[PDB]
Amino acid sequence: MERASLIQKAKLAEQAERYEDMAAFMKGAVEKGEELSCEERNLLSVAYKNVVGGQRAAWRVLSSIEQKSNEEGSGPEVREYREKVETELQGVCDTVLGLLDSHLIKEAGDAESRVFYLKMKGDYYRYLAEVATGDDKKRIIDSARSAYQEAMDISKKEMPPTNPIRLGLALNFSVFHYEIANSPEEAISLAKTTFDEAMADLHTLSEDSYKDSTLIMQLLRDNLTLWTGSGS
Amino acid sequence: ERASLIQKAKLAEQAERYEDMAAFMKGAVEKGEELSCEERNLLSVAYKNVVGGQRAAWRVLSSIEQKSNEEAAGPEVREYREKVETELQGVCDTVLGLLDSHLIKEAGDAESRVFYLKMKGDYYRYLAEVATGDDKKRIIDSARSAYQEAMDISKKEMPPTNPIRLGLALNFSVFHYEIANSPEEAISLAKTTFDEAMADLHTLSEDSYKDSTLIMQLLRDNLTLWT
């Protein structure tokens, strides 16, 4: 089907490293109104993650230049171009959130995929929050907070504390608390709690999941080590 | 203004947004001012990166299209390889379009005129790596007549150790071996360019010593690979 061609082409774009095209093919495939398989969700995620990743990296470089020029010692061209990048980035996030709302979230049946999409919804509102400045910041921060909270409530009632999707979601929500909401204590606390609960349930894991789950637990410990300790 | 476009192209280079860098350089060229040394290099980088990425992707796809013949396959591969091919053609046409009105006709000195006439030969050569039909011959010839006019405002204007003149000869020899499939002419041109620059090494200054020997390295590499 039209859908089978779009999926095949998205795989070719991944191999050709044409992520903008990969995103477009996955968008079109979603729009066929079929549920995404596990492999397909990951193709969708990779496409948009790469696209937004590049825009965020560039925005940081430009924002950094804009700030080092307003400092003691050292034209409006920097602001104009930083705004262009910002606007482009917003377009991508709005597109992603538009797809999750109409129609990935409301269209998913089982709990695993419902959590995956809500986590993605928090992730993309969090990306919008990284750049937002006005009265709009607060609303956006809150829409990311509810997407993550709704995903957390489902994962607690439907998944074991060692499930990698659950661990991934908690890890991102804690990063959101530290960096976005600027609630470092809540971030540290959520991270430790998630770790210790998964830790108590390690013995119940099968061989293949233990690798995936300990890898995410490594990321939680890394953040905890960073958030609780200096240098010098 | 032109000053803003130039400044923005520099920012895009730092943000690695080459598509945007190309667009800013195009706009700045269109002001009708001559490009300084720094500016020509921003223009060459901006389009080289863009086209480089498209060529690399086309090769990957063309390779997959050939490995599927024997024998999911489907027409999807061809459909997408054609999309990439078409996109690439648009870029080359844009480059050559301003390398015509105006860049080589707008330049006064010989170094600058050679730079643009090398670039024109380079972008026609790119159009060939994709073209196959009755069109493959015309394009090869437009790259050829561009490289020969460039090969003559070089031997008669620049020393045999000049890096621009070495760079141009290196590319024209690659055009003979790979595109025109005249391996003998390629080998001959390469060896000649090498040995003439070799005789004049002692006359080089400290800073040019590095740049010129580097090009001569790519010419002793090619000649120990091709033969």
Curated annotation (Swiss-Prot), chain A:
BP-aspect Gene Ontology terms: cAMP/PKA signal transduction; establishment of skin barrier; intrinsic apoptotic signaling pathway in response to DNA damage; keratinization; keratinocyte development; keratinocyte proliferation; negative regulation of innate immune response; negative regulation of keratinocyte proliferation
Annotated positions for site Interaction with phosphoserine on interacting protein: 56, 126
Modified residues (Phosphoserine): 5, 74
A cellular component term, taken from the record's GO annotations: extracellular exosome
GO MF annotations, alphabetized: cadherin binding; identical protein binding; phosphoserine residue binding; protein kinase binding; protein kinase C inhibitor activity; protein sequestering activity
Tissue: Present mainly in tissues enriched in stratified squamous keratinizing epithelium.
UniProt-listed InterPro entries: 14-3-3, 14-3-3_CS, 14-3-3_dom_sf, 14-3-3_domain, 14-3-3_sigma
Superkingdom of origin organism: Eukaryota
Subcellular localization(s) per the UniProt record: Cytoplasm; Nucleus; Secreted
Keyword set, alphabetical order: Cytoplasm, Nucleus, Phosphoprotein, Secreted, Ubl conjugation
Posttranslational modification: Ubiquitinated. Ubiquitination by RFFL induces proteasomal degradation and indirectly regulates p53/TP53 activation.
Role according to the record: Adapter protein implicated in the regulation of a large spectrum of both general and specialized signaling pathways. Binds to a large number of partners, usually by recognition of a phosphoserine or phosphothreonine motif. Binding generally results in the modulation of the activity of the binding partner. Promotes cytosolic retention of GBP1 GTPase by binding to phosphorylated GBP1, thereby inhibiting the innate immune response. Also acts as a TP53/p53-regulated inhibitor of G2/M progression.
Subunit structure: Homodimer. Interacts with KRT17 and SAMSN1. Found in a complex with XPO7, EIF4A1, ARHGAP1, VPS26A, VPS29 and VPS35. Interacts with GAB2. Interacts with SRPK2. Interacts with COPS6. Interacts with COP1; this interaction leads to proteasomal degradation. Interacts with the 'Thr-369' phosphorylated form of DAPK2. Interacts with PI4KB. Interacts with SLITRK1. Interacts with LRRK2; this interaction is dependent on LRRK2 phosphorylation.
Stated family: Belongs to the 14-3-3 family.
Protein name as catalogued: 14-3-3 protein sigma
Annotated organism of origin: Homo sapiens
Highest classification ranks of the organism: Eukaryota, Metazoa, Chordata, Craniata, Vertebrata
